[PDB]
Symmetry: C3
Subunit: 445 residues, 3 copies
């Protein structure tokens, strides 16, 4: 895939093109079970050091079970649960009489199995750990007699290893109120995640997509605690379904565009708004304003449509003609001429004002470009760093072509006296209407 960039000198903005999308649009919920042992404390006259170690690890198991019990009594309403609703609906089904018994029956002979619930949905269940078999077969003959039988040291170690995953899951669920994200390897192993991806009702190319970006899949997944009941600990893992694939995505970068007059206080500034990620989606454009809502791998963007706005496709015309009537291209105005830089995908935008020392250097050649007052841009081809004031930015060394689109900075088309200088989220046409109304008070005079 070819990554390209376009800096528009007229609007002090740059667009990084050539990225492919992966937008989350659905959820695939799955039930994860850990078969537990319903045991009560048993006392046999014991003093052997091995017996002591076993009883110690067994108390750590019983506290973990009671901790999971007090965790499942309190079921969280933290937030709008608008992104976990899919799994919360499964937990409400699991609380029905006979349903934990149902999953207990389907996973009686195999580890994984599809189960048709009574509410309806066809969930895929897994048995990832079997403590009921281990405690009842290897541990009860040790503690459930008049006098304790003596266990071998291999057993002490094997029980600390098996019980460890239960303890770590109780630790995470206790500090996070039953909802964890990302989903850790304790909640779901890479082997278990990959087998769960392979068993999903998705296309073969989409299974390849999730398997090559398992870390992004974990960051976009949730683990919700359901119930501990009748020797079963169940929790739902909610994995992302990417309904939008291989669509064009671009990233808009904006920087303040001011005039460069020599008398401070006589300068006016304009900045394009809505910087961030844009992706073509179902005849429209899905816009992502928060910076942390999109993880990028290679040329592919992984966004959650949960935190997007839906805009008309004409919003891209702000990149080719900011003055085009098909779309009201919004700006913000000020008189705050502070220098800054934006590291883009293939270069750097620099807004230099005042006495600020703006420059672009190569590690071995030194300063190769000095920016003047105004908004400018430099490609990463031959540039390693950019210094603005006392701050040094590193340029991304990604391969791609940059295009410098020359044009008059549009801030020069504005008369300063009638400029609206405190506008946040203003349209180009809105600013023009405030200027036409301010021109009428002068028309009479």
């Amino acid at each position: 895939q070819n990554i390209t960039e376009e800096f528009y000198q007229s609007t002090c903005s740059a667009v990084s093109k050539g990225y492919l999308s992966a937008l989350r649009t659905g959820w695939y919920t799955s039930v994860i079970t850990i078969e537990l042992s319903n045991i009560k404390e048993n006392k046999c006259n014991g003093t052997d050091a091995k017996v002591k170690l076993i009883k110690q690890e067994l108390d750590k198991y019983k506290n973990a079970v009671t901790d999971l019990q007090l965790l499942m009594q309190s079921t969280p309403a933290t937030g709008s649960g608008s992104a976990i609703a899919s799994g919360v609906a499964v937990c409400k089904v699991l609380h029905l009489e006979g349903e934990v018994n149902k999953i207990k029956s389907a996973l009686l002979s195999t580890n994984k199995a599809v189960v048709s619930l009574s509410n309806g949905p066809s969930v895929l269940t897994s048995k990832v750990l079997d403590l009921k078999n281990y405690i009842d077969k290897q541990l009860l003959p040790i503690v459930n007699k008049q006098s304790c039988s003596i266990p071998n040291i291999e057993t002490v170690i094997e029980f600390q290893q098996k019980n460890n995953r239960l303890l770590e899951i109780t630790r995470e669920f206790s500090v996070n109120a039953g909802v964890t994200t990302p989903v850790s390897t304790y909640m779901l192993t890479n082997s278990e995640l990959l087998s769960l991806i392979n068993d999903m009702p998705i296309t073969n190319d989409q299974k390849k997509l999730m398997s090559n970006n398992v870390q992004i899949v974990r960051q976009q997944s949730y683990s919700i605690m359901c119930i501990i009941k009748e020797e079963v600990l169940a929790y739902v893992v909610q994995l992302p379904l990417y309904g939008v694939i291989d669509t064009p995505c671009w990233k808009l970068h904006t920087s303040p565009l001011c005039t460069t007059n020599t008398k401070e206080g006589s300068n006016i500034c304009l900045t394009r708004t809505d910087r961030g990620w844009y992706c073509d989606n179902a005849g429209s454009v899905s816009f992502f304003p928060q910076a942390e809502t999109c993880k990028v791998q290679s040329n592919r963007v992984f966004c959650d449509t949960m935190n997007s706005l839906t805009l008309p496709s004409e919003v891209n015309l702000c990149n080719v003609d900011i003055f085009n009537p098909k779309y009201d291209c919004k700006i913000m105005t000020s008189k705050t001429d502070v220098s800054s830089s934006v590291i883009t995908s293939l270069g750097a935008i620099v807004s230099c004002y005042g006495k600020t020392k703006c420059t672009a250097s190569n590690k071995n050649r030194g300063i190769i470009k000095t920016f003047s007052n105004g908004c400018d841009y430099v490609s990463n081809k031959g540039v390693d760093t950019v210094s603005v004031g006392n701050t040094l930015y590193y340029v991304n060394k990604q391969e791609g072509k940059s295009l410098y689109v020359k044009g008059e900075p549009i801030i020069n088309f504005y008369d300063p006296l009638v400029f609206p200088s405190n506008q946040f989220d203003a349209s180009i046409s809105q600013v023009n209407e405030k200027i036409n109304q301010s021109l009428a008070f002068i028309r009479k005079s």
Copy 2:
């Protein structure tokens, strides 16, 4: 408890009522000690594999102690320490001569004990781990001779288990500069937290409150590292005291309210401000603007009054009459007609504008409601999802009654030509004064 909702069509806002409060107003500090062993490295000609394992775990203990020492030399001033002041004041007392010796004496025979410090306060101390007894009784006869005695394999395992909590506490305190929140099970066990709640000078009903929401108590607690001195590692756990209980709490939801003219650029928008949590508190209302400052369980809100504003009780009249002179009901204005949705507690607000496809569906029936241009609302009774553009929101399936309060959208009472379209944090009466002043420039003409 009955959860109810009221959508006000006139102001594009909804109020979720019936929630009970738990506001944090005080702190209960407590001293947590780990009795350590003042040992220096001891060398005996040793090569036995068991002796090697013991010396390895002992070096991990000595590095943990030196790591805690370099952690306590640097005492943080990170932030205004305005919420840890209560515990920082105890750490300054612990540094006095004889005070670590005092706690060392009170916990000489029992694990928990109340101690009257020299500064004054009556703190409750605990001994959660005893490494001085274990290292000096089970380990020194092994390393403090000419030739090492041979330890049994149970001892190697018991020492890795006991030393583990010390190592994990040093790990958390090293990456977090001595202040951790929430308070982990390593800092304080659920058994230790529950016993600490039971031993607190609080009402019996309030102990029941903290014991049923231990995960929320952990998220609202702090663990502060004090000192390692004279075979004692001490750190203060600061637990929340909820001075406001069972008060009425409601959640205000707001969404943009625009006109629906057919020519873009001729539309004006209004949005109610100060969305969030409101709770009755001491004759006033405690308002919480940040979303993460309130954890909800069932019908109970758990807020920290540290991040609240105090407002007059007349602020609720913005919910019944936005035009009421007893309180200046604030709005923000714009010309940005972008579609969005808000998932409320019992339904969903939808602001639909332009060509956006807004709809509300049931999983098995399909589309059951199409929203028109404007601000509207749908209850969760029969609705599962709401789609706005390319985004799908899930509706909370919580039981409750919704009330649709019909009324003319107030944005229609405004003449567009004289509307103030860039107002952030503006009052209703403030906007009316800008309109009366803009009406005077037209009165003469």
Copy 3:
């Protein structure tokens, strides 16, 4: 070092002086290697419990290696990688043919060694764990025969201890997409960090600085995963270089300054902007607007110049004469008279308006000061807490001198009718120009 404060009654702002700087200006990258064992699964008829435990831990090692392999295929472009560029450039060199073989040769006999790469830079390499020697010497004679040899129980335990660090590093790198910050003790031990500081090409006083603030150094460091290839797991640790040292730093605190008229809706408010940390840097001032970008220890501020603005040194004149023409001192305006408090370094600013109950108390004396309507200040000398409405703030008990600089609140110099009441990021002179233009519409009438 003497900490001092100055509250300016005229502008409702306070300045905390006497702090020394440590600004991050460079990066020191270092290569961290873990020598691994290229083994494939080996099967010998085995049933001994010790053999089973060893094969279990060996599968956990092989899954960790395959997990690191799928982690290094996906190389992240998450963000602008503008702060990890230095290490990402080293990872691209490590991928060259013969370079992992080069580091494998330089660390063949010693643990640490400086290596001149082919790209150029002179990196310092370390071998922190040696699994190739341990697996090939202690484990292969156990699994690579016709029938398995029987290992001793000390070996089972020693292998779970050595393999543990590899597993924890794979766990962190899997959930964080190869880039972790802060740098944990698993990524780099305190002993390894301190030895790495001692071996750095920095001044001896600067090594003392980083060694006494290792927790701040970890919070300002990055760990980047490079490659697993040819029995080598390599990742770069990027440590901060503090180019600005012992410079003057002050903290600006601002609070709303309103008029105290008795009729609500007739009041105007002004607040100084750009609150935060200021440090002298290279003839200018480095300003830090985000609150979490500066960690404070004692009297020293540790900032990253990556998130700073560079301002002229005349910006300090807003603290002595807000009306001074050398610098355009910016304010924001509103009519939102909401009470609040700011805990400063040596006292507290209180903006009290309306019916709000503002007070300052001592724990044992009770209320010692009642604030009137307006903006006021109290030193921490004799004050423990400050209550504003239903909120109680704790005052920092740091030793220092406070100075109350009396002056007329400048909001009283403004005629309310012509005040600009919706100004964000406005200069003093900008507001005066809007008043001169609004005075001309009245001049004719």
